Each structure stands twice: as structure tokens, then as C-alpha cells.
């Protein structure tokens, strides 16, 4: 479970879209291109702020089984296991 905090108030753009978004990326593709790879990252993104990643060595954890209502949002991952406290600006993911 991850708890990401955002700015403290420090045009209908970027707020209309559901806060941010998470995706599982394979390290097979990286910009530096040093050579190393072989693990996944739970990337989390929001328009202004910078992207964030979390390495997942374990092949599978918390990958549940039918925790069937169809509002795909972005994907099964996001609707299935994310919460966006937009009033306090806290994004929880588990």
C-alpha cells in the first residue's frame, strides 16, 4: 500500500481527469539505456508533478480474484485498487 501526498494549495484542466494514474511498466525500456533491466515498476503520474516508480521483484502480490461492474475508467488495475482523496490530495494505492 502506497500513500502519495500532493501540494497544499501552494481552467478545468487536469482536475477533470481522475486525479492521477498508475501503470505497471517493464524495465526492458529505459532512457539512459545503461543495460540493466528485468523487473517491473508501479509508476504513478499526475499532470504537473513528476512521475514516480516502485520496484516489484515479486512476480505477483495482492493480484486478487474478482474482488463485475463495468466502468473501465482507465483499466482494471485503477478502479480495482486505487483511491483518490481529492479533497486532501492523497492518492492511496493497494
Amino acid at each position: 500500500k502506497v500513500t502519495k501526498q500532493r501540494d497544499s494549495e501552494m481552467y478545468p484542466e487536469i482536475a477533470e481527469g481522475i486525479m492521477p494514474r498508475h501503470r505497471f511498466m517493464s524495465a526492458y525500456e529505459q532512457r539512459i539505456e545503461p543495460p540493466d533491466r528485468r523487473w517491473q515498476y508501479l509508476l504513478m503520474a499526475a499532470e504537473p508533478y513528476e512521475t514516480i516508480a516502485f520496484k516489484v521483484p515479486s512476480r505477483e502480490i495482492d493480484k486478487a480474484e474478482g474482488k463485475t461492474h463495468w466502468n473501465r475508467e482507465t483499466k482494471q488495475f485503477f478502479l480495482q485498487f486505487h483511491f483518490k482523496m481529492e479533497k486532501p490530495p492523497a492518492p492511496p494505492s493497494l
Binding site: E16, G17, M25, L43, E47, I52, V56, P57, T74
Partner: peptide
């Protein structure tokens, strides 16, 4: 709702998933 979802799909489809900057691992 459908509209907001649409927006989300657009942005998700339109961000660099190669701008990595990781911290730890589990």
C-alpha cells in the same frame, strides 16, 4: 462520468511511461 473516463483514457494514453525515476522495490 463517461466523459471524465474518456479524458482519463486520453491522458493515460498520452503520457511518457519511459520517464522513470524509481526509489525502492518490494
Amino acid at each position: 462520468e463517461e466523459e471524465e473516463k474518456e479524458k482519463e483514457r486520453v491522458a493515460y494514453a498520452q503520457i511518457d511511461w519511459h520517464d522513470f525515476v524509481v526509489v525502492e522495490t518490494v
